[PDB]
């Protein structure tokens, strides 16, 4: 009945959640026609999570596909999974943002948004019990910033009391792939820190870390970083389409992780993953799985949480897991490494076991941590930000299309009153006495 | 150089219908400055010390304060400021049914502190309405409904629903501001006195288990007052203005549920309402925490209230608290929370300054 | 569904067309018959891609461009060569005259009752296509048609389309090596003009790929079949997105913006790094650390103008072939390590990426190798102030003395205009200071 609406803008998330059917699919025993051809009975009972029943037990995901140019649908389309999406549900256009921010929020973002809410409320709508939204976007463009950022301005006060969960994939620190990411990013997080409830922040170059230093890959494409994304998402949303000892839907997580309104930027990660070679000399079992969780070489948001402190993490676990052996474990990290959390929260752990684990392993995590060492990312982009702003450099392009200096002065002072309400925790607190 | 502390202080109600009908018991009694509340058990007593008291509790026992002494006490000194060339702010805060409405509105035949200080604004003016100081006014009136705002002095259009919400946007030297905002002039006493009915009628108001004219919005009343002045120099006359802002501020209250039977858009209104409650007292908790050398961060962002009155609370401008309270048993916890708030409001110091209009331009320099 | 309309000024242009024409067919598997065999085995779907070449229901694909050369040699070339099939044959000759190497030729006098004939067939081709994202116009400076025709034209489709991206590919000037007396003036007064109105003006300088094609593929005697066959590659890459798949697609509209920071200095360099013969095609990786240094290897660019004399505003890097974003990554932390690449302090972030996943195809009588991977580099450097400044020197050396101006005045041309823009040319070579002078507070 929790019921999710999934929607994915631009070249990034139409590739990630291409990928995201893929591996729930797999989970559900779906082929690529819709078709069932599954083996256990716990699959068809929560399908209808990220599934719609079309005619004939054929199964139709709940899949929104936005961008404005045609080319990343016709990669769906003609590929594995393509013949299982609504085809009324592909919106496109042509002559996409530009990596212009100005674009897909106000002028071409404005005229194709009205048809994508159309199929938004036609999903909603069909739907018993919605439990919230999920959007895979990239911010660094012009459409996923852009047109996504507007779809959740508009979602947010259509469904205020409803989640709206986002996965985004954040400017690097070292090497850009498009010239205007600070404005695109700013702009975006100045929307965002007002209307959204989680949002998961990913970075490329961390997963070129783990691709390179865990699985010992080394020629990752983007399939396989984005193999990686669809396991997190699919781990959030474990405990609404399987049983378990203790469960937790999104907002029980978003209460236990989100202490002021604001701070609801997190930093992912999964586990266990290794190498095709290691697989055979390792034990699995949580002391080994908690290990790679919280070392800070298998976070996704390319930000060390050992220059901060975790004012909240969680750990989603799948298997026949013993709930001593998790509750342990959890206590040894706050008690071993007191100095990375705080204090005026005593238990700054979560826990979730769902007991019908992933395809191929006997037990996986899922983790989702909130740190100060998110101050990194949003300090870093205020700088090249004002750097660039200073001298308007390349400010021309988003005037011309209906902005103002007033809207980039906005997003800066935004960002940097975020940057001072983690930094305030992150420095160890004392009262008089206590 | 200059530190002004904000000036709290604090009003007793009288008792009402239902705190007759269940025939509550006296617990907040005065001696003039002080303010103590007997808790019925008798085990603890709290005391509390105010700039400012009234007790309205009896209209015949002596130490009765009066919307005109409450007046000639609170509003006098900051409209004297503004005159001088200040900004000031008033703001009400407490529980349902306790009397800031009351109190800084008023009644047809009760009026509050906005007519008073508007008559004597205008009074000052025409005695003062010289060749030397010309006088301009502008005013605005909005409000906050479930985190929307709202302009009240408009003549709505005929729909299904008319409500058209306005932005808050940053400045970066004036601060926030809404976008969009009736900035209309006054001449005298008549336009806003119009004005005023217009939107104290358009504000939101309904009938709950503790009001039956609850306001259901936080209502602020923006005065831009700009003075012209001449000095004798090189070429022409005219060349020094002051400006100035006076923010009168209306708040609703926290709203149990459970006592004020709501279902539905109350609920949803009221639910609101405690959220901005729960942002304000946090604001007045971190600047009465940073006014003892401690750092903190005030939240100003999460609550548009808080947003636009980003320069009221701190930052600049010569402001007082009016807290109400009322003197029943049964809301005990509640009226002491409004205490306790108002006694650390007391601790709060603002850098006020005269908006010459000059500074960094040539008069700075020649200071 | 996303087209791109083609415009070949003068000799230059309708050289490279011919050099573009002719790569544009074979990726896509047409014949010069306009014909499509490997249809047979597909059935459809977009192989007569649509960004380029239309398609008539025989079968038939007939391209998206419109020839000007005022001058019937070129263009007859074409009505009697190996593509007379393919083309429309509004071929837009009105020869009777040519230029004469004079922008006051090109701009007024023969420029007109032509420049109304030309602007039919563009909106007959726009009114064909629906989602036209821009104009890609291929002329020179230094003669009367590429520097006054397209002056003429870029005015009027800045009137009749507004807001569309205009790229150009432009021959710029070399600094020593010259076919004319007369590139300063024509080079100066066409700046002036389509300044205002261009977005993106790609440039290219023959005395550099006479120089690549010397080192790197040991051609000694070259001539302009081979120039103009390593442009027909920079403009497969800038629209091979629009046509193939990939990972990183880039739209036209991402050059007008990271390599264009203010509305006047829109002038980028090109370069292709992988020009090597099939017998250097062997002995060498290929890989993307290898082709990514290549790019700023300045001997290797297509443009003559050391960028160790200024400083790098962007940079946009365009892949095509079996490349992985994370050798991408590497490449770009290698030249932000390196010294002698300097980047601006107010573009910290100064590279765009684009990934493409079709390889280049390799021309039959041609001089580049088969290869796997391929890029393509597009940079604004502040270093171009240098070759302002030259075409500045001598513009002033031969105005003094009002050498040539009797012919520009013959054809209606104002001695003020000389005056006017060289004034603005000479505010141009300032902004490029500014650009380049390090922010303080
Ligand atoms: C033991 C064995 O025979 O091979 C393993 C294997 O080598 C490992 C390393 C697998 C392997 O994963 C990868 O090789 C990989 C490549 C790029 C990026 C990420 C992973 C495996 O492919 C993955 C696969 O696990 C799954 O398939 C999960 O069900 C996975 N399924 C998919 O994602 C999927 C993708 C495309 C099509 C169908 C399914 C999954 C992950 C999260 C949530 C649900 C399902 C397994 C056990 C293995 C192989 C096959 C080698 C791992 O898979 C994950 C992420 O759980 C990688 O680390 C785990 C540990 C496994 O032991
Ligand atoms: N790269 C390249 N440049 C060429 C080619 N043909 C001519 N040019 C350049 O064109 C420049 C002068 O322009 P023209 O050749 O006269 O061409 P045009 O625009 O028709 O000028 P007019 O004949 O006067 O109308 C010379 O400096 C040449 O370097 C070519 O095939 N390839
Ligand atoms: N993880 C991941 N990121 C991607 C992928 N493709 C693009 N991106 C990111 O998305 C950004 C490009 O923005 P994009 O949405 O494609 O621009 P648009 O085409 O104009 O909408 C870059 O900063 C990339 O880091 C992908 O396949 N995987
Ligand atoms: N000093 C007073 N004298 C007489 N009546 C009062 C006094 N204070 C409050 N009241 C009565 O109590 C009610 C106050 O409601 P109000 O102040 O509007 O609630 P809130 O303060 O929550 O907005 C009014 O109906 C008013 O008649
Ligand atoms: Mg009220
Ligand atoms: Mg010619």
Same mark, same amino acid.
């Given at each position: 009945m929790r019921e999710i609406v999934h929607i994915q803008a631009g070249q990034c998330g139409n590739q990630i959640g291409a990928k995201f059917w893929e591996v729930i699919s797999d989970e559900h025993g779906i082929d690529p026609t819709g078709s069932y051809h599954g083996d256990s009975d716990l699959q068809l009972e929560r399908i209808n999570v990220y599934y719609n029943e079309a005619t004939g037990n054929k199964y139709v995901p709940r899949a929104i596909l936005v961008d404005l140019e045609p080319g990343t649908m016709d990669s769906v389309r003609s590929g594995p999974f393509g013949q299982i999406f609504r085809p009324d549900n592909f919106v496109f256009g042509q002559s996409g943002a530009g990596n212009n921010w100005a674009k897909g929020h106000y002028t071409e973002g404005a005229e194709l948004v009205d048809s994508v809410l159309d199929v938004v409320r036609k999903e909603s709508e069909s739907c018993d019990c919605l439990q919230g939204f999920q959007l895979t976007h990239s911010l660094g463009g012009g459409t996923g910033s852009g047109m996504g950022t507007l779809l959740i301005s508009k979602i947010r006060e259509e469904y205020p009391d409803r989640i709206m969960n986002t996965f985004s994939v954040m400017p690097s620190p070292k090497v850009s792939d498009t010239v205007v990411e600070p404005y695109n990013a700013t702009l975006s997080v100045h929307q965002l820190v007002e209307n959204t409830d989680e949002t998961y922040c990913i970075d490329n170059e961390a997963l070129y870390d783990i691709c390179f230093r865990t699985l010992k890959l080394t020629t990752p494409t983007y399939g396989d970083l984005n193999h990686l994304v669809s396991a997190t998402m699919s781990g959030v949303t474990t405990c609404l389409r399987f049983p378990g000892q203790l469960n937790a839907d999104l907002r029980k997580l978003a209460v236990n992780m989100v202490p002021f309104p604001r701070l609801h930027f997190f930093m992912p990660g999964f586990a266990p993953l290794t190498s095709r070679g290691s697989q055979q000399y390792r034990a699995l079992t949580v002391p080994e799985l908690t290990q790679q969780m919280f070392d800070?070489?298998?976070?996704?948001?390319?930000?060390?949480p050992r220059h901060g402190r975790y004012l909240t993490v969680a750990a989603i676990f799948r298997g026949r897991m013993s709930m001593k052996e998790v509750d342990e474990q959890m206590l040894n990290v706050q008690n071993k490494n007191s100095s990375y959390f705080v204090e005026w929260i005593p238990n700054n752990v979560k826990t979730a076991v769902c007991d019908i684990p992933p395809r191929g392993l006997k037990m996986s995590a899922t983790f989702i941590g909130n740190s100060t060492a998110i101050q990194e990312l949003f300090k870093r982009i205020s700088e090249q930000f004002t750097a660039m702003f200073r001298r308007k450099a390349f400010l021309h392009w988003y005037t011309g299309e209906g902005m103002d200096e007033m809207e980039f002065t906005e997003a800066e002072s935004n960002m940097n009153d975020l940057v001072s309400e983690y930094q305030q925790y992150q420095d160890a607190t004392a009262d008089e006495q206590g | 150089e200059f530190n002004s502390q904000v000036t709290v202080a604090v009003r007793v109600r009288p008792f009402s219908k239902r705190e007759k009908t269940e025939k509550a018991s006296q617990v907040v009694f005065t001696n003039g400055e002080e303010i103590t509340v007997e808790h019925p058990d008798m085990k603890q007593v709290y005391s509390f010390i105010y700039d400012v008291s009234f007790w309205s509790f009896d209209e015949c026992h002596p130490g009765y304060a009066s919307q005109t002494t409450v007046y000639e006490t609170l509003a006098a000194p900051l409209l004297d400021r503004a005159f001088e060339g200040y900004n000031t702010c008033l703001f009400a805060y407490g529980q349902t049914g306790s009397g800031k409405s009351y109190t800084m509105m008023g009644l047809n035949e009760e009026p509050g502190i906005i007519p008073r200080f508007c008559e004597d604004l205008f009074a000052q003016i025409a005695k003062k309405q010289t060749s030397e100081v010309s006088y301009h006014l502008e005013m605005s009136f909005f409000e906050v409904y479930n985190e929307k705002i709202h302009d009240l002095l408009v003549c709505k259009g005929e729909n299904g629903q008319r409500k058209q919400p306005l932005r808050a946007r940053e400045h970066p030297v004036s601060g926030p501001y809404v976008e969009g905002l009736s900035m209309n002039v006054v001449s005298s006493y008549s336009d806003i006195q119009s004005w005023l009915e217009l939107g104290n009628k358009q504000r939101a108001t309904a009938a709950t288990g503790m009001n039956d004219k609850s306001s259901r919005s936080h209502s602020v009343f923006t005065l831009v007052m700009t003075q012209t002045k001449t000095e004798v120099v090189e070429g022409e006359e005219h060349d020094h203005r002051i400006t100035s802002r006076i923010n009168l501020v209306d708040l609703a209250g926290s709203e149990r549920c459970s006592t004020a039977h709501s279902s539905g858009q109350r609920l949803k209104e009221g639910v609101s309402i405690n959220k901005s409650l729960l942002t304000l007292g946090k604001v007045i908790s971190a600047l009465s925490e940073q006014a003892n050398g401690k750092r903190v961060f005030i939240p100003y962002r999460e609550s548009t209230l808080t947003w636009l009155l980003k320069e009221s609370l701190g930052g600049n401008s010569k402001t007082a608290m009016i807290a109400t309270v009322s003197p029943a048993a049964s809301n005990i916890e509640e009226t002491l929370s409004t205490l306790r708030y108002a006694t650390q409001a007391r601790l709060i110091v603002n850098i006020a300054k005269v908006n010459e209009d000059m500074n960094a331009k040539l008069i700075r320099e020649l200071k | 569904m996303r087209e791109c309309i083609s415009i070949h000024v003068g000799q230059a242009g309708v050289q490279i067309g011919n050099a573009c024409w002719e790569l544009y067919c074979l990726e896509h598997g047409i014949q010069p018959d306009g014909?499509?065999?490997? $249809?047979?085995?597909?059935?459809?779907?977009? $192989?007569?891609?649509?960004?380029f070449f239309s398609e008539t229901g025989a079968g038939k694909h007939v391209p998206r461009a419109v020839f000007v050369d005022l001058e019937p040699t070129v263009i007859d070339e074409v009505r009697t060569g190996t593509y007379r099939q393919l083309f429309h044959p509004e071929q837009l000759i009105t020869g009777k005259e040519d230029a004469a190497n004079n922008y006051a030729r090109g701009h007024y006098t023969i420029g007109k009752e032509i420049i109304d004939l030309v602007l039919d067939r563009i909106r007959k081709l726009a009114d064909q296509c629906t989602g036209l994202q821009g104009f890609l116009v291929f002329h020179s400076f230094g003669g009367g048609t590429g520097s006054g025709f397209t002056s003429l034209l870029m005015e009027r489709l800045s009137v009749d389309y507004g807001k569309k991206s205009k790229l150009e590919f432009s021959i710029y000037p070399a600094p020593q090596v010259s076919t004319a007396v007369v590139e300063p003036y024509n080079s100066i007064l066409t700046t002036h003009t389509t300044l205002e109105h261009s977005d993106c003006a790609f440039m290219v300088d023959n005395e550099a790929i006479y120089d690549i094609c010397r080192r790197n593929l040991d051609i000694e005697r070259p001539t302009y079949t081979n120039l103009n066959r390593l442009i027909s590659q920079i403009v497969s890459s800038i629209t091979a997105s629009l046509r193939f798949d990939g990972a990183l697609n880039v739209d036209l509209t991402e050059f007008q913006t990271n390599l264009v920071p203010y509305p006047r200095i829109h002038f980028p360099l090109a370069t292709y790094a992988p020009v090597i013969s099939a017998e250097k095609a062997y002995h060498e990786q290929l890989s993307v650390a290898e082709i990514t240094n290549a790019c700023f290897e300045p001997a290797n660019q297509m443009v003559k103008c050391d960028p160790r004399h200024g400083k790098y505003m962007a940079c946009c890097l365009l892949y095509r072939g079996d490349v992985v974003p994370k050798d991408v990554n590497a490449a770009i932390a290698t030249i932000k390590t390196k010294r002698s690449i300097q980047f601006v302090d107010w573009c910290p972030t100064g590279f765009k990426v684009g990934i493409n996943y079709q390889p280049p195809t390799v021309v039959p009588g041609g001089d580049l190798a088969k290869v796997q991977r391929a890029v393509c580099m597009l940079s604004n450097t502040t270093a171009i102030a240098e070759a302002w400044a030259r075409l500045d020197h001598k513009f002033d050396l031969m105005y003094a003395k009002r050498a040539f101006v009797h012919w520009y005045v013959g054809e209606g041309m104002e001695e003020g205009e000389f005056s006017e823009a060289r004034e603005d040319m000479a505010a141009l070579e300032k902004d490029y200071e500014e650009v380049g002078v390090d922010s303080v507070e």
């Open positions: 800070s070489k298998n976070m996704m948001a390319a930000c060390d | - | 014909q499509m065999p490997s $249809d047979k085995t597909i059935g459809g779907g977009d $192989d007569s891609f649509n960004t």
